[PDB]
Amino acid sequence: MVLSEGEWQLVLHVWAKVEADVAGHGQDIFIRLFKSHPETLEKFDRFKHLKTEAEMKASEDLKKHGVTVLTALGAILKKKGHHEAELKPLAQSHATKHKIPIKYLEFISEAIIHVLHSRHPGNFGADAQGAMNKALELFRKDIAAKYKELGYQG
Numbered sequence: 001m002v003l004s005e006g007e008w009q010l011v012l013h014v015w016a017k018v019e020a021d022v023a024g025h026g027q028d029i030f031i032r033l034f035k036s037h038p039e040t041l042e043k044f045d046r047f048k049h050l051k052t053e054a055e056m057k058a059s060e061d062l063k064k065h066g067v068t069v070l071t072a073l074g075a076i077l078k079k080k081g082h083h084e085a086e087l088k089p090l091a092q093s094h095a096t097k098h099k100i101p102i103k104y105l106e107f108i109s110e111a112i113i114h115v116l117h118s119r120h121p122g123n124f125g126a127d128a129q130g131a132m133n134k135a136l137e138l139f140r141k142d143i144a145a146k147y148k149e150l151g152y153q154g
């Protein structure tokens, strides 16, 4: 699949807003993910002890992790589809070291859309959400293909 320049513009326009507060968006997204799909929390040995949203918000390590994740995702989105090089190491660590099923990538994609919808309604209307979903589907599709080449079905 391929996004048009118009769709990329919608994606990058709302992403520019997210970059005004990467740490904050990172926390909201992971808290949403962990609360909505608690099973994903078990994949993080560093955070699986967190019991409440309050503890999650107060975790300095979780906040730093969120920044690392969103920074990596932002770099991929800014490539506008030409992300082969960026995807290689990400696909290897998540398939081989962390063992993250494609299903879980769908869950975090849902969390990202939910947070952008809540925080940026004016810049995240129907068309913008469709563009973001398409960009994330492309990401998940290419990651899945790499998973297979690497020997991980998940």
Ligand code: HEM
Pocket: 040, 041, 043, 044, 045, 046, 068, 069, 070, 072, 073, 089, 090, 093, 094, 098, 100, 104, 105, 108
């Ligand atoms: C938007 C998709 C995602 C991106 C861009 C992303 C990115 C990253 C990055 C850059 C790191 C640090 C470097 C590395 O280990 O490769 C990381 C670590 C990790 N990711 Fe992801 N990730 C994504 C989704 C997920 C999901 C859905 C899970 C599982 C629910 C997951 C689990 C992990 C784990 C367990 C680590 C190691 C954390 C640690 O122990 O420090 N990731 N991820």
